[PDB]
Each structure stands twice: as structure tokens, then as C-alpha cells.
Motif scaffolding. Structure first.
Motif, PDB file in Angstrom:
ATOM      1  N   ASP A 375       0.854  -1.320   0.443  1.00 46.34           N
ATOM      2  CA  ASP A 375      -0.127  -0.274   0.033  1.00 46.34           C
ATOM      3  C   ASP A 375       1.048   1.374  -0.162  1.00 46.34           C
ATOM      4  O   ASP A 375       1.064   1.551   1.092  1.00 46.34           O
ATOM      5  CB  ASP A 375      -1.292  -0.216   1.736  1.00 46.34           C
ATOM      6  N   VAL A 376       1.500   2.559  -1.026  1.00 43.70           N
ATOM      7  CA  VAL A 376       2.050   2.842  -1.570  1.00 43.70           C
ATOM      8  C   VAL A 376       1.984   4.113  -0.633  1.00 43.70           C
ATOM      9  O   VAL A 376       1.906   5.236  -0.083  1.00 43.70           O
ATOM     10  CB  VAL A 376       2.426   3.233  -3.074  1.00 43.70           C
ATOM     11  N   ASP A 377       0.732   4.567  -1.525  1.00 35.49           N
ATOM     12  CA  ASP A 377       0.067   5.856  -0.955  1.00 35.49           C
ATOM     13  C   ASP A 377      -1.360   5.448  -0.041  1.00 35.49           C
ATOM     14  O   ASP A 377      -1.293   7.311   0.085  1.00 35.49           O
ATOM     15  CB  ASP A 377      -0.805   6.516  -2.223  1.00 35.49           C
ATOM     16  N   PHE A 378      -1.508   4.810   0.811  1.00 34.84           N
ATOM     17  CA  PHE A 378      -1.999   4.621   2.182  1.00 34.84           C
ATOM     18  C   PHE A 378      -3.449   4.587   1.926  1.00 34.84           C
ATOM     19  O   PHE A 378      -4.242   4.883   2.601  1.00 34.84           O
ATOM     20  CB  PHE A 378      -1.484   5.696   3.456  1.00 34.84           C
ATOM     21  N   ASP A 379      -4.721   4.040   0.695  1.00 28.82           N
ATOM     22  CA  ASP A 379      -4.880   3.812   0.757  1.00 28.82           C
ATOM     23  C   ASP A 379      -6.230   3.266   0.886  1.00 28.82           C
ATOM     24  O   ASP A 379      -7.196   2.604   0.298  1.00 28.82           O
ATOM     25  CB  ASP A 379      -5.753   4.188  -0.709  1.00 28.82           C
ATOM     26  N   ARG A 381      -5.460  -0.486   0.000  1.00 28.70           N
ATOM     27  CA  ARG A 381      -5.531  -1.819  -0.955  1.00 28.70           C
ATOM     28  C   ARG A 381      -3.862  -1.125  -1.435  1.00 28.70           C
ATOM     29  O   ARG A 381      -2.669  -0.876  -1.075  1.00 28.70           O
ATOM     30  CB  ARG A 381      -6.588  -1.296  -2.102  1.00 28.70           C
ATOM     31  N   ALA A 382      -3.580  -2.736  -2.600  1.00 33.34           N
ATOM     32  CA  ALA A 382      -1.836  -2.621  -2.429  1.00 33.34           C
ATOM     33  C   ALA A 382      -1.649  -2.840  -4.184  1.00 33.34           C
ATOM     34  O   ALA A 382      -2.380  -3.326  -4.484  1.00 33.34           O
ATOM     35  CB  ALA A 382      -1.859  -3.610  -1.370  1.00 33.34           C
ATOM     36  N   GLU A 383      -1.229  -1.847  -3.780  1.00 30.94           N
ATOM     37  CA  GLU A 383      -0.441  -1.932  -5.590  1.00 30.94           C
ATOM     38  C   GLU A 383       0.527  -2.880  -5.883  1.00 30.94           C
ATOM     39  O   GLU A 383       0.952  -3.579  -5.262  1.00 30.94           O
ATOM     40  CB  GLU A 383       0.747  -0.058  -5.855  1.00 30.94           C
ATOM     41  N   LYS A 396      -2.314  -0.490  -9.945  1.00 27.06           N
ATOM     42  CA  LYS A 396      -3.066  -0.250  -8.705  1.00 27.06           C
ATOM     43  C   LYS A 396      -3.903  -1.599  -9.551  1.00 27.06           C
ATOM     44  O   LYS A 396      -4.857  -1.253  -9.810  1.00 27.06           O
ATOM     45  CB  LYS A 396      -3.327   1.424  -9.219  1.00 27.06           C
ATOM     46  N   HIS A 398      -6.869  -3.179  -7.279  1.00 29.96           N
ATOM     47  CA  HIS A 398      -8.222  -2.044  -7.145  1.00 29.96           C
ATOM     48  C   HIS A 398      -8.646  -0.913  -8.141  1.00 29.96           C
ATOM     49  O   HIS A 398      -9.676  -0.502  -7.710  1.00 29.96           O
ATOM     50  CB  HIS A 398      -8.042  -1.698  -5.739  1.00 29.96           C
TER      51      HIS A 398
HETATM   52 CA   LIG Z   1      -2.354   1.640  -2.375  1.00 34.36          CA
END
Ligand SMILES: [Ca+2]
Ligand SMILES: OC[C@H]1O[C@H](O)[C@H](O)[C@@H](O)[C@@H]1O
Length: 628
Positions: A375-379, A381-383, A396, A398
Motif C-alpha cells: 500500500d504505497v499511497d495509503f488508500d 489497498r495494495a499496489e 493499481k 484495485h
Molecule cells: Ca495503495
């Protein structure tokens, strides 16, 4: 009554050379020339690193005028993070370096800086520790800042002590008046006069106000006028003749106007009217102290693209901490402008953001490649980050299972350095800091708003009779649910195989299923598509690739092709898309209606190239991206 006068000169990294020179001739140079002729006038100045570097390069003699004035006690060098980063938004270890670099420049200029101009006056009760370790003794913040804490303008005419950990630091307040009075007919003489009898009056603002702003090109008069019974000194001089008021704790604020910009669009609109309303009812002056908006940090919430860019440099900053050559690069990528947007272009100015991505990429080009999930940008979900010797692709799952990042280690450019078209609260013009403009029809005509984020390999389903101008603007009828919906993935030998089971939501919902097997190549990537519709249906399948063409003013095109090249000299490289089955290509400039000092900014944030294929039950093809 004590008076502290000071300016803040800065130019964002990546700004146009001519823009730099202008600011120079317009104010940097004139100001210091007029300052030299009033030996009693003392100015507290802060030059940003990017500006000092340009000056050092193009106008060396200027640096001598500074050593001169410093030597004749007319200047106190105010410091900060070398590359104008928002101190609160970069790693603790990077601040020390950032500050120390500028702290070292000032020393070479002959001054021992003891104060720091808080960039964008963004404050968080934790910069105390950093500032202290950096050997800094006082920070310059806004009077507003003290208000949001519990004090009243009446008791904001002295510097205070603020603490965190067990350390303290002196905080000086910036009178909102002065930053609106100066420059404008010496009335300050009155406010100053009406200051009576420690107690100071502090003015500190952008130097661009003195000559670069809209027709701002008074000073010579202000200088000797100031030089009566008004005791004007320099910060340092003050913190030796007096001690701060007392201890007071500040809240996470900035200057007043940030409160509106930092809010998400709708809340910004709401906030403005709430302030207009209080003013109209003449009650804003007695209650303002209790009126507040958003916080700077939330621009990472307001502009996703800014958040991703910010979280990507954070990862790299850590991976490159002890690497001096790479590290320098990551520090440049922290130049604040380009991460947010208020009155100035900011994140809407492509070259400012092309510079951040350049430095993030240069900083990591030579690191060891490694594919990783997270989860790079902290949303939540996982990139999927796939990376080889030439590129870094961030996918992405998701979200359409699309490539949200394709950085070229070779060019240090991010092919997807694009912005989605969004509605800004100030896009609403009524009535028909305090200048404005209405939206001209020539723009209104082409002013559209996206509902989709703009990535590479976004899968659509449209009517075979759809028009480009309808898709171009957002008047088309998206048939599928594969653009903004999640895809399942499975790591492949050199990439990721994604797929989703949505449907082509038309009169009847013909369940669909798209498959893309993305794998990086020595020169880009190659995605193998497969779209099998459960029930037969007449429709067009389209793959969209958003490229960051920034220096080539493009226009809407439609054409048949199996292959084609994009050429953005001064922008992204020269790339080529290669299908294995000719298709209908739809190309169009992504125009953004942005704001600035001058006026409205309709800026090409990029260009969308979407390949349309016909489909009824089965479709297969291969999109290949080749860097040239
Ligand atoms: Ca993410
Ligand atoms: O961000 C817009 C401007 O707001 C205020 O005028 C600040 O004094 C200045 O530093 C800033 O550039």
C-alpha cells in the motif's frame, strides 16, 4: 514601538529561466539597490536555495552586493530547508540536512543565521526538535497562528516561546495588517504610530510583492520614512535586547488563506461563503479568532497525484539516506510548490511536477531493482511495483488494474505525470490576494470534468457510434465497469496478470471479463489483452494510455493505425505504441482550468491516446509501449 522588516525570496525548482531573470530584474536586484542607499535600513531576508543557485550561476555580482550589505549591518540572513520543502512533510533526518545546507550557504555569504522562515508557514509541534538540532533559535510564523491558539491580536506584539519534547524555540508573529499594507501608501506610519509603548511590529512577506506581482513595479519613500521614534531592528538584534513573552503552544496552522485552499473543493466553497457572510454581517472581526479551515497536509487528500508523488519520494528518501549522490536528488524532490495549489499554479504547473519526478527517479535509478507489493499511497489497498533496469511500473489492481506509474530511469521522466480534470471551488464565478476573473466562453466551451483517474491501460466499453468530442469532454456513455473497478492479479514471470469480471451495462447487462497480462520489457512494456463477452453484443473496447506530453500543444485527432509515435521534446521522450491489430485511435489534450496571479490557467496536463477495437463476443490484441 519596535519594528522588524523582512522579505522572503524564492523561486520553485524547475521554474523557467526567464521567470527567474524577471523576478531578479523586477525586484531582487532593485530592492537591494535601493536598500544599499539607506544605511540605516535593516532588512531580514531569506533566499531559497534554488534561487541562490540561479543567482550564483547567472548573476554573481549580486552575491557580492549581499556580502556588502551584511557586512554593513543592513541584512540578517534568514534560513530554512535549502530546497524550500515543507519542513513538516519531509523525514526528520532530511530537515537537518536541508536546513544545514542553507545554513552553510549563509555562512559563506558571511552571516551566522539564527532564524528560519517557515516555508508556507505550515507548522506542527515537532519542528521544535529539528530546528533546535539545526542550531536555530527562532522561527517566523503568522499572528494568525497565535490566534488559533487562544490569544488575541492585542497580545501578539511580542515573540513567544513554544515547546515540544523539553526544548523551546522563539516564535515571531507576522502581523496580517502589514502584509496587506506594505506595499501601499505609507499608512504603516499610522499603524506603527498607533503602536505606542519590548513590543514589536513584524512584517515578513514574499519579496516578489516588491516588483514582480501584477503591476507592482513607494519603497525609497518607505525606507527613510521608517528610518522617527520607530525603533526598527533585526530579529537577532531583538533576541538579545529582550526575551520572548512567555510560553504558548501553537496549533497545526498556516497563514489564514491556506485555510480555504487546503480544504477539499466543496468545503472550500462552503468556507468562503461562511467568511463572506460573517463579514457582510460585520461580525467577522470579533469572531475570526474562531474561524478556521483546513490544514496544508490535507492537499495529499485533495490531490491524490500529489500524495502518490509524496509517498514515493518518502520511500526513496529512506532507501537513499546514506547515499550522498542519490540523496542530493531526493532532497531536491522535496521543493514544496508542485505538491499543493492555492493561488499560484503549483501542482497544476507541469514543469514544477516534472522536476519532482525527475529527482525522485534520478535518486533511485541506480538502486537495486525489486518487485514488491504494498500500500504505497495509503488508500488501504495494495499496489504492485514491477521494476527492471530501465523502468519502474506501479500498478493499481484495485483500480482498473492500471499502470499508475511508469518512470523512465533512462529519461528520469514519469510517462504518467498527468492530472485528472477536477472542479476547483473558485471555478464558480459570481457577482457579475483579492483579484479575480470570469471564465471566458472560449474556455467554457472546452471545460470538462473527469470522473476517472488518468492512468495507463484503462479499459473502456463504448457505443460503436460514439463521438470523439463526447468522449473528449465527458459527455460519452461509458458502457463497462472496468475503469474504476478492481482486478484480480497473479505475479507473472516478468509482470502481472490481471483480470476482472464486470459487465457491459447497457439495455441488458452482458457480463464481461477482461484480461491483461502486463510484463515489463527492456524498453517499456507489453500488455496482452483478451476480452470475452458472455452474451453477444455490438460494442467497442478501448484501451486508454495517458501520456505526459507537456511541451507539444496537441489537439483532438481521430485516426486508423496499427502503430504510432508520440514526440514530446522537452517533455517525455519519444515513445511508440505498437498494436498487433490496427484500431481506431482517439487522441485529445487534457486541459485544466487553473488559477494564478495573472489569471486563468488552461494547461495541457497531458494527452490521452485510447485505442478502440470492435467487439461482439471475442477480442484479442497486444499493446506494446516502446521508449525511443
Ligand atoms: Ca495503495
Ligand atoms: O501562497 C500565497 C501567498 O500567501 C501570502 O501572501 C504569503 O505571505 C505568501 O508567502 C504566499 O506566497
Amino acid at each position: 514601538i519596535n519594528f522588524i522588516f523582512g522579505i522572503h525570496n524564492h523561486q520553485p525548482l524547475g521554474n523557467f529561466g526567464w521567470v527567474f531573470e524577471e523576478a531578479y530584474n523586477r525586484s531582487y536586484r532593485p530592492f537591494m539597490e535601493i536598500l544599499e542607499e539607506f544605511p540605516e535600513m535593516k532588512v531580514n531576508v531569506h533566499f531559497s536555495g534554488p534561487l541562490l543557485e540561479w543567482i550564483e550561476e547567472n548573476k554573481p555580482d549580486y552575491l557580492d552586493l549581499l556580502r556588502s550589505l551584511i557586512k554593513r549591518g543592513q541584512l540578517e540572513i534568514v534560513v530554512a530547508g535549502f530546497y524550500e520543502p515543507v519542513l513538516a512533510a519531509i523525514p526528520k533526518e532530511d530537515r537537518l540536512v536541508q536546513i544545514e545546507m542553507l545554513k552553510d550557504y549563509a555562512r559563506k555569504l558571511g552571516y551566522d543565521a539564527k532564524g528560519v522562515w517557515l516555508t508556507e508557514r505550515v507548522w506542527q509541534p515537532e519542528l521544535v526538535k529539528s530546528l533546535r538540532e539545526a542550531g536555530i533559535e527562532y522561527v517566523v510564523v503568522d499572528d494568525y497562528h497565535f490566534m488559533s491558539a487562544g490569544l488575541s491580536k492585542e497580545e501578539l506584539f511580542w515573540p513567544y516561546y513554544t515547546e515540544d519534547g523539553g526544548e523551546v524555540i522563539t516564535v515571531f508573529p507576522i502581523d496580517e495588517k502589514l502584509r496587506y499594507l506594505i506595499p501601499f501608501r505609507p499608512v504603516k506610519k499610522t499603524i506603527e504610530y498607533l503602536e505606542s509603548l519590548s513590543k514589536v511590529a513584524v512584517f515578513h512577506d514574499d519579496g516578489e510583492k516588491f516588483g514582480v506581482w501584477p503591476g507592482t513595479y513607494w519603497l525609497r519613500e518607505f525606507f527613510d520614512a521608517i528610518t522617527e521614534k520607530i525603533n526598527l531592528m533585526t530579529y537577532s538584534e531583538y533576541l538579545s535586547k529582550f526575551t520572548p513573552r512567555g510560553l504558548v503552544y501553537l496549533p497545526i496552522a498556516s497563514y489564514f488563506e491556506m485555510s480555504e485552499w487546503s480544504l477539499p473543493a466543496k468545503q472550500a466553497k462552503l468556507f468562503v461563503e461562511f467568511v463572506e457572510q460573517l463579514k457582510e454581517e460585520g461580525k467577522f472581526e470579533k469572531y475570526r479568532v474562531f474561524v478556521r479551515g483546513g490544514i496544508w497536509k490535507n492537499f495529499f487528500f485533495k490531490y491524490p497525484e500529489s500524495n502518490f508523488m509524496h509517498k514515493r519520494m518518502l520511500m526513496v528518501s529512506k532507501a537513499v539516506r546514506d547515499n550522498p549522490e542519490a540523496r542530493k536528488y531526493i532532497l531536491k524532490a522535496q521543493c514544496n510548490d508542485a505538491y499543493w495549489h492555492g493561488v499560484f499554479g503549483g501542482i497544476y504547473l507541469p514543469h514544477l511536477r516534472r522536476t519532482v519526478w525527475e529527482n525522485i527517479i534520478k535518486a533511485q535509478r541506480y538502486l537495486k531493482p525489486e518487485n514488491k507489493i504494498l500500500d504505497v499511497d495509503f488508500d488501504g489497498r495494495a499496489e504492485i511495483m514491477v521494476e527492471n533496469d530501465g523502468f519502474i511500473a506501479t500498478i493499481k489492481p484495485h483500480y482498473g488494474g492500471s499502470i499508475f506509474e511508469l518512470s523512465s530511469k533512462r529519461k528520469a521522466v514519469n510517462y504518467n505525470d498527468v492530472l485528472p480534470r477536477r472542479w476547483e471551488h473558485y471555478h464558480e464565478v459570481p457577482e457579475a490576494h483579492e483579484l479575480g476573473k470570469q471564465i471566458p466562453e472560449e474556455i467554457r466551451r472546452e471545460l470538462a470534468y473527469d470522473w476517472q483517474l488518468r492512468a495507463i491501460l484503462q479499459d473502456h466499453f463504448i457505443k460503436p457510434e460514439e463521438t470523439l468530442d463526447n468522449y473528449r469532454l465527458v459527455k460519452y456513455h461509458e458502457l463497462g465497469d472496468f475503469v474504476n473497478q478492481p482486478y484480480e492479479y497473479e505475479m507473472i514471470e516478468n509482470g502481472v496478470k490481471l483480470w476482472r469480471e464486470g459487465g457491459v451495462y447497457a439495455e441488458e447487462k452482458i457480463p464481461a471479463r477482461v484480461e491483461k497480462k502486463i510484463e515489463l520489457t527492456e524498453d517499456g512494456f507489453i500488455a496482452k489483452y483478451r476480452v470475452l463477452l458472455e452474451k453477444p453484443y455490438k460494442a467497442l473496447f478501448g484501451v486508454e494510455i495517458n501520456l505526459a506530453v507537456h511541451s507539444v500543444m496537441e489537439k483532438p485527432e481521430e485516426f486508423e493505425a496499427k502503430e504510432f509515435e508520440v514526440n514530446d521534446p522537452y517533455g517525455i521522450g519519444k515513445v511508440r505504441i505498437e498494436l498487433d491489430k490496427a484500431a481506431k485511435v482517439w487522441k485529445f489534450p487534457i486541459k485544466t482550468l487553473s488559477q494564478s496571479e495573472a489569471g486563468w490557467d488552461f494547461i495541457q496536463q497531458g494527452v490521452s491516446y485510447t485505442m478502440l477495437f470492435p467487439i461482439e463476443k471475442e477480442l484479442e490484441f497486444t499493446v506494446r509501449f516502446r521508449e525511443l
